[PDB]
Amino acid sequence: QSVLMQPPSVSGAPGQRVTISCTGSSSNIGAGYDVHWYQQLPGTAPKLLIYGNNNRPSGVPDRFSGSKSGTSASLAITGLQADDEADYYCQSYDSSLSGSKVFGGGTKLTVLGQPKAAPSVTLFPPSSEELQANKATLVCLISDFYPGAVTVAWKADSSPVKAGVETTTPSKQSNNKYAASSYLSLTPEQWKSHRSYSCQVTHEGSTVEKTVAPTE
Amino acid sequence: QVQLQESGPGLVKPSETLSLTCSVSGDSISSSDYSWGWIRQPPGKGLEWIGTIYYIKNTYYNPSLRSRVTLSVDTSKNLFSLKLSSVTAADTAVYYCARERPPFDVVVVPAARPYNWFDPWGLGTLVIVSSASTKGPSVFPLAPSSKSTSGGTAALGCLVKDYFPEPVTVSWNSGALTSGVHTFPAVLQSSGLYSLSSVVTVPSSSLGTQTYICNVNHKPSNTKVDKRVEPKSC
Amino acid sequence: NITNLCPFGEVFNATRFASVYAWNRKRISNCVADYSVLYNSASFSTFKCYGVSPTKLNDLCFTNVYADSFVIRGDEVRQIAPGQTGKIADYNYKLPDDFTGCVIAWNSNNLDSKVGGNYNYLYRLFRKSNLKPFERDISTEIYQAGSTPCNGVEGFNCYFPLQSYGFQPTNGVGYQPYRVVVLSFELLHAPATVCGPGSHHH
Ligand SMILES: *[C@@H]1O[C@H](CO)[C@@H](O[C@@H]2O[C@H](CO)[C@@H](O[C@@H]3O[C@H](CO)[C@@H](O)[C@H](O)[C@@H]3O)[C@H](O)[C@H]2NC(C)=O)[C@H](O)[C@H]1NC(C)=O
C-alpha cells in the first residue's frame, strides 16, 4: 500500500525507450510538490536517480529523464541497457493531515532477454492432513512466466483478503523462466465459512485466476 | 563524499523496542543544511518513510508511525538514532538511513522541507521481528487433484510449514527426481516462523505407477521427514 | 513645475520582489501619476480596479498612494481582491471589502523561476487568526497546532509557519510565479498630493 501509484512492471528490449508513470493526487504531486526518483539495483540500497522532477545528479547518465504534469510524473529511460534492470521508486510530499513524505509502490523494469510468457497457476486447497492438525493453508503456485513480475490478490467470496497472505518474490527456475508462490493461512473454521476462494495473478496487465471450494 | 553506516540488532522479539544507530562520515550531523532520515523496506515490498531529524532537535514523523518513533542525535559520535517501540511482525524490514537534503540555493531551510530528497543512502540493515525458538517443520502433501489428472501434466508438491530458523533442504525421491522440480524460497509468517513449498510437474499417467516422496531436511532442529504425495480423492 | 512623474518604475521594474508574507510597501507622494501609461507599460495578466471607474482614473487626485508588491503563484492572483479567502488572503495579504485601488499582476516565470527550481519565495501556511486588511506578518515563530508548547522546536503539532513555492519553468501556469503590485489611494482630510495629468488641478 502506497500513496503514489506506479505500474508494477515495465519492460522493453535493449536499446528501446521506456516510461514509468507515477500518479498522485491534488494533495501531493498536484499540490505543487516535487517528485524524486530512486533506483534500486537488485541486492543494493536505493540510490537517487532524479531529483526535483527532472534534475540529474552527477553520475546519472543522459538516458534518464524525468518530468511532471498535473497530478502525474514520469521517468523516461532511453537506450535501454541490461545495467538498467532494477526497481524504480518515485517519491513526493503529501500535505494532507499533518504532511508526510510518500513513496510509490515501485516498478520492476525488465530488459527483455527472452520471450514473454504468461504464468501457469495452480491452486492447492489445504490437505486433509493439515486440517486434521487444525490448520488450513491455501497454496497458489505460479510458474513459467517472463518478465519475473507478478501481482497476487486473494479473494474469499469476492472479498479481498489482506491478512494471512504471504508472497515470494519471483525467482528463476531451471528453464530460466520465473516462478512465485503465495499463501493464504486460515483456521479451518474460516476455511469452511466461505463458498470459494480465488487466487488472482496479474502479469503484464493480464489477470488469470484459479478457484477452490471447501465443498469440492 | 558522505557515507552512512547503519547498525542494529538483527533479531528483536515482538513487543520490544528496536534501537538502530546510523554513523555519518564526511559530514557533521550538527548541520543546519542537511537532515537525517530513516526509511524501511519489508522484504519483497516497497519503501516507507519512518521519520527525519534536523539540527539536533527538530523532528518530523510518518503520521502512521509517529506514536512509536523516537529519533535523536549524538554530536559526540556524529551519529543519529531510531527507536521503534512495541514491534510486531509487520516491522520486519531492511532499515536504511539517509541524508535528506534541501534543494540547492535555499536560504530558509525549514521552509523547503517538502521539496527535500534523500541522498546519499546507507547500506541498510535487516531487522527480523520474531519470538520463535528453533523448531522443526511440519510437512503436508500438496496432492494432485482430479483437475490436472484429466490432462497431460499433473502438478504435485510438499508444503514445509512453521520452521525456524532457515534453511530447509528439499529433494524428491532421495534425489532421483529432479526435472520439473522447483523449490520456492521461504516466506516469513506473522507467527515468526518460516514456510516454503516444493512443486514438481509430472506425467499424469504416472500417478498410479510412480511413487512420489519429498525429502525434507532442517539441520538446525536435526529434523528429517519423508512425505509421500498421492492423489487422495476430494 | 511639478513635472516629475511618479516613480512607478521603481516598484514595477524592481529586479527582485518580496515574498508575499513579507510584502513590500512603497510610499508615493508629491508627483504626477498618469495611469494610462501604466495600462500601456507592458502586457499585464491582471489589471482590475475597485471603488473608482478605470475609465477616468487620470482625472482623480489623492493624498498619497501606496504600492505594495510581492510574488505569488498564478492560481492565487484571484485571492488579491475584496471579499476573498484562502491562505494568501487569510494569512499573507488581505484587502478590505471597501477597497479603493487597483490590483496589477503579470507572469514572471522568466525572472522568478529557474531550472532546478527557485524555492526562495515563501508564503505563510499557518496562523492563529486571519489578517486584518493591510496588516503584515513577518514572524517565524513555530506554530503551536496542539496543546503542548513548542519551545522553538519543530515536532508533531509544532510546525514552521512558512513554506516555499516551488517555481520551475515548466510548471503549469497556475503554479508559475506572478508579480503583483497593489495600488492603494489614500483619501484623507488633507490636500491632495498625487494627481493625474487630466485633472483640473493640472
Ligand atoms: C520598465 O522598464 C521598461 C523597459 O526599460 C519600460 O518600457 C519602456 O518604456 C519607455 C517609455 O518611456 C518606452 O519608450 C517609449 O517609446 C514610445 C515609442 O515607441 C514613445 O511614445 C514614448 O514616449 C517612449 O519614448 C520604451 O520603448 C519601453 N521599452 C520596452 C522594452 O518596452 C517601462 O516603461 C518601465 N516601467 C515603468 C512602470 O516605468
Residue numbers in the entry:
A (entry chain L): 1 to 216
B (entry chain H): 1 to 234
C (entry chain A): 331 to 532
What's in the article?
Crystal structures of group A potent neutralizing antibodies WRAIR-2125 and WRAIR-2173 in complex with the SARS-CoV-2 RBD were analyzed to a final resolution of 3.77 Å and 2.2 Å, respectively. Both group A mAbs target the ACE2 binding site with overlapping, but distinct epitopes. WRAIR-2173 forms extensive interactions across the entire length of the ACE2 receptor-binding region, whereas WRAIR-2125 is focused to one side and engages fewer RBD residues. The WRAIR-2173 mAb epitope is >900 Å2 with heavy and light chains contributing ~65% and 35% of total BSA, respectively. WRAIR-2173 recognition of SARS-CoV-2 RBD is also based primarily on CDR H2–3 and CDR L1–3. The CDR H2 and H3 loops cover ~200 Å2 and >400 Å2 of the RBD interface, respectively. CDR H2 residues K55, N56, T57 and Y58 interact with RBD residues 483–486, while CDR H3 recognition involves extensive hydrophobic contacts using CDR H3 residues P98–Y100J to interact with RBD residues K444, Y449, N450, L452 and Q493–Y495. Viral escape experiments also identified p.Phe486Leu and p.Tyr489His as escape mutations for WRAIR-2125 and p.Tyr449Asp for WRAIR-2173, each in agreement with the structural and epitope mapping data. Among potent neutralizing mAbs, RBD mAb WRAIR-2125 retained binding to all VOCs tested, while RBD mAb WRAIR-2173 binding was ablated by the combined double and triple mutations found in VOCs such as B.1.351 and P.1. Similarly, WRAIR-2173 also forms a strong contact with residue E484 (BSA 94.7 Å2) and minor contacts with N501 (BSA 3.6 Å2), resulting in a lack of neutralization with B.1.351 (Beta) while still maintaining robust neutralization of other VOCs.
